[PDB]
C-alpha cells in the first residue's frame, strides 16, 4: 500500500488480487491497476 519499492515491497497484494476468480476479470483487473497505482 503504497510502497516506494512497489514491486520488491508489493507482491504478495498483487498475487493475492490475481488469484481470486470470484472478482472477475475487470474488477480484478483494477484492483492490480490501484496496488500499483497508488
Do not use: G, T
Not at 3 to 8: D, H, I, Y
Not at 27 to 32: E, L, M, P, V
Amino acid at each position: 500500500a503504497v510502497a516506494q519499492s512497489f514491486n520488491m515491497q508489493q507482491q504478495r497484494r498483487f498475487y493475492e488480487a490475481l488469484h481470486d476468480p470470484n472478482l472477475n476479470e475487470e474488477q480484478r483487473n483494477a484492483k492490480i491497476k490501484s496496488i500499483r497505482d497508488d
